[PDB]
Design a protein around this ligand. Structure first.
Ligand SMILES: COC(=O)N[C@H](C(=O)NN(Cc1ccc(-c2cccnc2)cc1)C[C@@](O)(Cc1ccccc1)C(=O)N[C@H]1c2ccccc2C[C@H]1O)C(C)(C)C
Lengths: 99, 99
């Protein structure tokens, strides 16, 4: 689809059989979701944003659907203000910016 | 143009008679630039990202050019780690997300 930016580009995603609202974020290198449970082992990661860095849990090869488009990649979990879908997954679903 | 997301979507912008590199960020409500001088009146504002909030100066009705596309809007100035072009200006140049 083609999404304009007059409002936040919030879309429905599906992870672990549950639906969640997430922000399509071209300015985010990674994908970070609010506290939740994910399978397997996780690795440590520090991600930096406008107000500084936060520690998150990194899970790899996680199945996640974005607007119906299936992807399998790295998902970070931590104290983020909102669920963010970053470039690692935006590239998987074939997303681009156009003007 | 069509911008891929394999790398951060960085573009050149022209503002206040200065050429700067900025990030096209669909996950940003506002446009915030690193410390610089701008004309006119300003008001203080607190904006939050991952990591928390930072204090910035808000300047309204500021002319900016992005990839040759002219626009006018509010520009925030403060301690941001990178120059960010938010939705308030992305809409003006007709930028959309497509997949
Ligand atoms: C509305 O607030 C905003 O729009 N905030 C904007 C904002 O911070 N936007 N977003 C997500 C984001 C989205 C929502 C909220 C948020 C906070 C409180 C209440 N409601 C929403 C915070 C962060 C994140 C931004 O792309 C902005 C940014 C870009 C480059 C450098 C530093 C920061 C970002 O944080 N990118 C980083 C990120 C995000 C997730 C995983 C990894 C990484 C690494 C970075 O790529 C702002 C401050 C520029 C204008």
């Amino acid at each position: 689809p083609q999404i304009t930016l007059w409002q936040r580009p919030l879309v429905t995603i599906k992870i672990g059989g549950q639906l969640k609202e997430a922000l399509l974020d071209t300015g985010a290198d990674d994908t970070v979701l609010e506290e939740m449970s994910l399978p397997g082992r996780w690795k440590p990661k520090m991600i930096g944003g406008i107000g500084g860095f936060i520690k998150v849990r990194q899970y790899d090869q996680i199945l996640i659907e974005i607007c119906g488009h299936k992807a399998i990649g790295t998902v970070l979990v931590g104290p983020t203000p909102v669920n963010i879908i970053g470039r690692n997954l935006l590239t998987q679903i074939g997303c681009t910016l156009n003007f």
